[PDB]
C-alpha cells in the first residue's frame, strides 16, 4: 500500500520510488515527509516551494494524480508526519539563533504586510514574511484546513458558491522587489498608485507561480500592459 | 466550516440544515455522524443503505456536491466521527445480543458467500452477508479509507487499482434465501445461479453509483431473463 512505488521526487527523477523508499533516504534530523501536489510533473518541478526544502537536503515527493493527494491526507503520518508544502509548514526550526534573529526582521516588515493586506483586501487571509521562500519574491500558501491548488482546479469545473480557501500571501524578505516595497511603504508610499498596481500585479503572479488561476485575467493583462508601457517614452 | 447550513437529511428534507443542527438532533446513544454521497438528491433519497440507519433513529446527511464530500473527509471528525455509509462502517456495537445470533447465520451462509465469491471472482474484495442492508437483496459497499463511489466518478472525468468493493447480501431477502437452497443443493456452478448473482452484482453496481464492466454482457443477461417469460 505504501510500498506502491509510483512517484517521482526531488531525490529521484526518471526512476519511480515508493513512500517506504523515501523514508530510508531521510537524514536523521528530518522529522517530516515532504510532498507537493500539482497537475503535472513540469508544473511542480519548478515550484518556488521546493527551494527552501532542497537547501536543507530534504526530499520532496511528486503527486500528479489526485488519488494520491487524498491518500496522504487520510493517513497523516508514517513515523513522521506527512504534509503538503503548498500549505503551511514549519521547517525544522533551523537553529534557535535564527528564530530570534528573525523576529527582529519580521518586526520592521509588518508596516509593509499591513499595507499589502489593505491593498489586497479580502483576496487573502494573511500577508506574511516567509523564510521558506527563496528565489522568488512572493508566493501563495494554502491554509492548514483548505484546498491544494490541484484540488481547487478539479473542483472548479464541478461547482461555481460553497466558498474556497483562506489563502496566505507570503513575501520573501531577501527579495529586491519586497525590499524596495518596504522602503516605499516606510517612506509614505502606502497609497501611491504605482505601488498599489504592482503589488496587485505581484500578487497575481504568485497565484500562477503557486498553481492557482486568476479571476478576470483582463484586469491582470491591463496591469501588465501598463507596466511594459512604462518604458516607452 | 460546520455551521454553513447546506444539506438535506433523512430528518430534514425540503429545509436545509447544518452539521451543528444534526448534532443536536442525535439521540444520546448515537456515537457517529452519518452521511451519504451521490449524484443527485433524487438518486440518494432512495438508496438501500438508508433503511438500516432510519430503523435505528439515526439521521443521515445528503451530500450531492463533491466539494462538500471532500470537506467532510478532510474534517474526519466533529466530536464524533463523520463517515460515509456508502463505504464500510461498523454499526454502533449493535448489542451483545446480536453478536451471537449473527455468528450462527454467517456460518450457514458460508456455502453461499464462498460460492458467490467464485462467480464474481476478482471484481470484489469480499462477499459477506450484511444486516445493514434491508429492503434489497444486494448492494456494493466501497471499502473504507478509500474513495466514495461518487468521488471515483468525478476524478475519472477530470493497473487502475480503483477501490476494494464488497458485495453485501441480505439474508432477509427471498431472492437470497433461494440461492442458499440451490447452493446447498450442489448449485455453486449451476447455470441459473451464476447468471442470477452476476445479474444482481451488476445491478448492485448501478444502484450504488458505479458503472458496468461490459454493458452488453448485462443486457443479454437481462433479455435472456425476460425471454424466459415467453417459453
Residue numbers in the entry:
A (entry chain B): 439 to 598, 605 to 677
B (entry chain A): 439 to 596, 605 to 677
Q: Which of the paper's sentences describe this entry?
A:
These clients represent key signalling proteins, which when dysregulated lead to disease, including cancer and neurodegeneration.
The structure revealed two dimer molecules of the Hsp90 fragment in the asymmetric unit, but only one of the dimers contained bound LA1011. Superimposition of the LA1011-bound Hsp90 dimer with the apo-dimer revealed that the unoccupied site is restricted (especially by the side chain of Leu 674) and requires movement of a helix (Pro 661 to Leu 676) to form an open site able to accept LA1011. However, LA1011 was found to bind in a small hydrophobic pocket at the extreme C-terminus of the dimer interface of Hsp90. The binding pocket was lined by a series of hydrophobic and hydrophilic amino acid residues, but there were no obvious hydrophilic interactions. The pocket was lined by the amino acids Leu 671, Ile 672, Leu 674, Gly 675 and Leu 676 from one molecule of the dimer and by Glu 624, Leu 625, Arg 628, Thr 638, Asp 641, Leu 642, Leu 671 and Leu 674 from the other protomer. The structure presented herein showed that LA1011 binds to the opposite end of the C-terminal domain of Hsp90 in relation to the site suggested using molecular dynamics. However, this does not escape the fact that it is clear that LA1011 directly competes with FKBP51 for binding to the extreme C-terminal hydrophobic pocket of Hsp90. It appears that the trifluoromethyl phenyl group of LA1011, to some degree, mimics a key binding residue of FKBP51 (Phe 413), PP5 (Phe 148) and AIP (Phe 324), such that future development of LA1011 would need to focus on this key interaction.
